[PDB]
Design a protein around this ligand. Structure first.
Ligand SMILES: [Zn+2]
Ligand SMILES: [Zn+2]
Ligand SMILES: [Zn+2]
Lengths: 46, 64, 54, 237, 121, 391, 168
């Protein structure tokens, strides 16, 4: 976290850049980080 | 169609002034409002009578 | 918010972030695929440090 | 389709529409709109390649990347490398009659496109043309007082006409599409460079590049709304 | 920032291949028996947050476009005060409303973006 | 003496506007469109399908207006009388026919618009109008059919020939499409739709593109369409689409397109894959191939050319459209505004009655080839045209 | 009153300056969004607050200045007819116009009408009407109020028909 740049670096574990680029889309879209499905914005109000 | 005989609102005869109104303008060169006041039509109700008549008959009589 | 904690601006932040849906995608600036064949060192200046932790 | 859209400015009336189900879909042409009747493209086409248009078969995008794509009724006929030459001549030629006045030409300077249209059913209107220069310093409308008097002598003899106005490059007809490539002044005084507390506020000419001026704003209306007095003092409905 | 290669002989695109022994990157073709070595190890990029295209349109003739607003800003290059200016031409919901100015003597492009991270445009 | 060079002022606009209206009056939209019909569209309707299988029509004259009588017969008809007798202010049509061997002439009544060039009242003066019992103020631009005065209302439609792109909502498997309605001033008005589709939503898996051609019952990968036209190598194909070699963005977008069409590497093949999607099992290859060639020469982007040498022009235009779509996908341009009036056309009298009188002159010319397919060996139904008009 | 209209005119002037700084502020990228709301949305929400808070202050201004004998006021007073917004629009300023909840939108490319230059987000460009009905509208104003107007006239036929079917 100190590191000044955030970087994630991924490899698989024979035809290997397809699985990469689907893998990538799973990454980017079907990973829930924090939060509850379906709740797209939340706003505070007083 | 034709000058109306009286002011709608006051009764003043106004049917006997159209000839003259128009001679006052074309023959003695008066502007429409000094003309109308010459004819004695000094309330706005009768003014409007002269001032806004439209002599449509003139165009009706062109048909045979 | 829970009865004690309802006029902490900072406890309703936390609550908003425990709820609001968050994917890798909202945080990700770019992705890339490189040929970097030797898993013990690297074509990438910048991840020398990263790698150098294993 | 029911809403008034910015692009009906000046071609359809912003007021006259029937209530109900037609609302919006029944329109009436502005007092001065017209609609093209179509005219054949083939001199334009031919002129274009006299003026340096390159044909699609020779086009090599990789070797002419800066080029302007030229379309005529919706066909890509090729590319050109000085469209600004081309366009200054085209317009000259339509402002003297040699390309018909109801033809439309647009150049889109950043899109690197020049689109011309010569088909029927486009609706249009006239505007003044505004030119730098003169000599006399600023951008001025091309008509001037003498043109007007020739107009009015003609009126009073009841020969200078409408068309004399188009032929001389003083007025030109503009359709919605070419309206997007211009900038129009609302009153001729926005060209020259203590107020009556009772007059309406207007916010000035922050404009040195007009290419045209409206003839009169009150032409945006149609037949009916041209009969209401002071419709600029009424709620819209 | 991938840059895209084609067969010398066929003009078809090339695809990456690992040289399994010597641990290197090749581009081969699928039609020919053409191969060549790779120029970089980058084979693919995906910008979720992108600027390509902010400055789409800046053309030699930008200054004859009468629609464009103009300002008396000065350039960083020419010390000129003849610009035309526009907003991002990306067309995002998620764009900033920053200004890009085009110097009409020297053709240099410059922003009003106080948080300028950009070298080029 | 006041400078002739002087700049005008706001008052002076009304002069110009009076001048506009003295010349044009208030319904030129009506008149100018009828007159161009009369003068130019008519005749052009006869010299598209002029000949059959021999017989070819030539020149047209149009009569002044007149009536087929009850008894004492055929007579100049003024608009006043057509109104009062429930008549139909019409004139008639005359071609110039030719018999020529290979194994004047009335043809009907055209309702004429008042104040057009062909109606008596355009030339008339004031006086003449009063004698005729026509008010000097009437302006024309309507017809009289069966005595009732009848106006055509302009109709609004989209223009043709225009490329529009569109995003498509959420449960759809296409995400953008691009679409043109291709069509003609000369030929007919045959209206093919090309659509160009980008498959898969924002990060589906290989987003591809493919195009829907007419009579072809599968969508065809766009690279296969470019090879069927003749542009074979990835390299040249992408070049008609992405006119900037440093847009790595777009070209990365075109990769799955290139894998989609990697099975077909020359134009015969390409023909054939398309040909097969248009013919039945059985049909032989060279007949397939030519199916595909004919679809593409005749029914794919026909506003460009419908004749033989014209492939670099369609390839480019297909390319451009794909460029359009991508630019929208990549979020550099907005989806097209379907409410831009500049993109609309309004159809009046002219073109409405040419929908019509072309449609029926093409019944009337097909009734001629049945004086002829059934002749084992100047005999024409006139009315069909007269009453299709008036009806 | 002449004094009141000078105060109305400034009231209005002040709001146009506040939008101008918001503008420049966004144009230097120093504006912040707050949380999920875009930048641009943030900007709009702000200039429309500003312009309507103008409209309103300008009208309260008028309302105060007019006298007890003011017959419009006498009607509102009694209840019989007219409200604030009426006084306001007639006498001080008609206000921001809008179509689907937003400022007049760029129907031509990057602009609301060809009498403006591109990228113009100012009041006048996207639909504020400064004037009152007494004073009358400008051409531009005129057209954007009718855009607005129109939206109601459709929204009211759709209302009335949606409404009758529910009722039954
Ligand atoms: Zn009286
Ligand atoms: Zn090869
Ligand atoms: Zn510079």
């Amino acid at each position: 976290d100190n590191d000044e740049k955030l970087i994630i670096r991924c490899r698989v574990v024979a035809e290997e850049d397809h699985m990469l680029k689907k893998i990538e889309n799973t990454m980017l879209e079907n990973i829930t980080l924090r939060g509850v499905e379906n709740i797209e914005r939340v706003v505070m109000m007083k | 169609m034709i000058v109306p005989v009286r002011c709608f609102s006051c009764g003043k005869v106004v049917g006997d002034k159209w000839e003259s109104y128009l001679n006052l303008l074309q023959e003695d060169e008066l502007d429409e409002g000094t003309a109308l006041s010459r004819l004695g039509l000094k309330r706005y109700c009768c003014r409007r009578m002269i001032l806004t008549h439209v002599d449509l008959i003139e165009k009706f009589l062109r048909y045979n | 918010l829970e009865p004690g904690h309802a006029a902490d601006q900072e406890q309703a932040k936390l609550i908003r972030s425990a709820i609001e849906h968050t994917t890798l995608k909202s945080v990700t600036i770019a992705s890339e695929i490189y040929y970097d064949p030797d898993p013990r060192s690297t074509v990438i200046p910048e991840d020398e440090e990263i790698i150098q932790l294993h | 389709p029911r809403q008034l859209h910015n692009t009906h400015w000046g071609l359809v009336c912003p007021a006259e529409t029937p209530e109900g189900q037609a609302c919006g879909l029944v329109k009436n042409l502005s007092l001065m709109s017209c609609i093209s009747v179509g005219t054949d493209p083939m001199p334009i086409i031919t002129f274009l390649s006299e003026w340096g248009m390159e044909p699609l078969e020779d086009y090599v995008p990789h070797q002419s990347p800066d080029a302007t794509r030229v379309f005529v009724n919706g066909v890509w006929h090729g590319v050109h490398r000085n469209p600004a030459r081309l366009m200054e001549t085209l317009r000259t030629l339509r402002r003297k009659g040699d390309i018909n006045p109801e033809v439309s030409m647009i150049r889109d300077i950043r899109e690197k496109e020049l689109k011309i249209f010569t088909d029927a059913g486009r609706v249009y209107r006239p505007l003044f043309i505004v030119e730098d220069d003169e000599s006399l310093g600023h951008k001025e409308l091309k008509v001037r007082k003498g043109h007007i008097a020739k107009l009015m002598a003609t009126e009073y003899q009841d020969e200078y006409t409408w068309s004399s106005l188009l032929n001389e490059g003083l007025v030109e007809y503009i359709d919605a599409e070419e309206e997007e490539s211009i900038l129009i002044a609302m009153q001729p005084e926005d060209l020259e460079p203590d107020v009556d507390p009772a007059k309406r506020i207007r916010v000035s000419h922050h404009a040195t590049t007009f290419t045209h001026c409206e003839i009169h704003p009150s032409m945006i209306l149609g037949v009916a709304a041209s009969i209401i007095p002071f419709p600029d003092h009424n709620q819209s409905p | 920032m991938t840059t895209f290669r084609f067969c010398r002989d066929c003009n078809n695109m090339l695809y990456p291949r690992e040289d399994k022994e010597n641990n290197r990157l090749l581009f081969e073709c699928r039609t020919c028996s053409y191969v060549e070595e790779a120029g970089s190890p980058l084979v693919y990029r995906h910008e979720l947050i992108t600027n390509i295209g902010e400055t789409a349109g800046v053309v030699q003739d930008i200054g004859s476009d009468p629609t464009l607003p103009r300002s008396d800003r000065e350039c960083p290059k020419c010390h000129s005060r003849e610009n035309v200016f526009f907003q991002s031409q990306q067309r995002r919901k998620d764009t900033s409303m920053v200004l890009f100015f085009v110097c009409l003597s020297c053709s240099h492009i410059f922003t009003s973006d106080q948080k300028n991270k950009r070298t080029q445009f | 003496f006041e400078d002739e060079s002087a700049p005008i002022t706001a008052e002076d606009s009304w002069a110009v506007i009076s001048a506009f209206f003295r010349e044009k009056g208030l319904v030129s939209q009506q008149l100018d469109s009828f007159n161009q019909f009369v003068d130019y569209t008519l005749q052009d309707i006869i010299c598209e399908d002029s000949t059959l299988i021999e017989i070819s029509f030539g020149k047209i004259y149009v009569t002044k207006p007149m009536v087929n009588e009850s008894d004492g017969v055929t007579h100049a008809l003024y608009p006043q009388e057509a109104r009062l007798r429930n008549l139909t202010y019409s004139s008639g049509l005359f071609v110039d026919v030719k018999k020529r061997t290979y194994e004047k002439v009335f043809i009907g009544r055209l309702p004429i618009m008042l104040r057009s060039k062909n109606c008596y009242l355009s030339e008339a003066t004031e006086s003449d109008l009063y004698k005729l019992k026509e008010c000097p103020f009437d302006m024309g631009g309507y017809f009289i059919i069966n005595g009732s005065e009848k106006v055509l209302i302009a109709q609004e439609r989209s223009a043709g020939n225009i490329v529009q792109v569109f995003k498509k909502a959420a449960p759809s498997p296409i995400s953008h499409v691009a679409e043109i309605r291709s069509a003609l001033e000369k030929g007919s008005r045959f209206i093919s739709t090309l659509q160009v589709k980008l498959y898969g939503r924002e990060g589906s898996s290989a987003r591809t593109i493919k195009a829907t051609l007419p009579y072809i019952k599968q969508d065809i990968p766009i690279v296969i369409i470019f090879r069927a036209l003749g542009i074979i190598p990835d390299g040249e194909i992408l070049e008609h689409i992405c006119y900037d070699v440093n847009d790595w963005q777009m070209l990365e977008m075109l990769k799955p397109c290139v894998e989609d069409g990697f099975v077909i590497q020359d134009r015969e093949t390409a023909l054939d894959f398309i040909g097969r999607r248009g013919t039945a099992l059985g049909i032989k290859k060279e007949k397939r191939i030519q199916y595909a060639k004919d679809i593409l020469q005749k029914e794919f982007l026909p506003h460009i050319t419908q004749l033989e040498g014209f492939e670099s022009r369609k390839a480019f235009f297909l390319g451009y459209m794909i460029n359009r779509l991508l630019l929208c996908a990549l979020d550099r341009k907005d989806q097209d505004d379907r409410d831009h009036f500049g993109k609309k056309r309004l159809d009046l009298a002219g073109p409405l009655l040419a929908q019509l009188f072309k449609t029926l002159f093409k019944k009337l010319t097909k009734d001629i080839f049945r004086y002829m397919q059934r002749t084992v060996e100047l005999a024409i139904n006139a009315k069909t045209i007269t009453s299709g008009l008036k009806y | 009153d002449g004094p009141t209209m000078r105060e109305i005119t400034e009231t209005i002037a002040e709001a146009k300056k506040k939008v101008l700084d918001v503008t420049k502020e966004a144009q230097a990228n120093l504006l912040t969004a707050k949380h999920g709301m875009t930048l641009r949305e943030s900007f709009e929400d702000n200039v429309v607050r500003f312009l309507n808070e103008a409209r309103d202050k300008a009208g309260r201004l008028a309302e105060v200045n007019l006298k007890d004998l003011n017959n419009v006021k006498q009607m509102v007073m009694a209840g019989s007819k007219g409200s604030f917004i009426n006084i306001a629009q007639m006498s001080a300023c008609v206000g921001q116009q809008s179509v689907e909840g937003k400022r007049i939108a760029f129907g031509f490319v990057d602009r609301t009408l060809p009498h403006f230059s591109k990228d113009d987000y100012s009041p006048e460009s996207k639909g504020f009407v400064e004037n009152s009905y007494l004073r009358g509208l400008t051409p531009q104003e005129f057209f954007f109020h009718a855009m607005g107007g129109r939206e109601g006239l459709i929204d009211t036929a759709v209302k009335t028909a949606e409404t009758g079917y529910i009722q039954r």
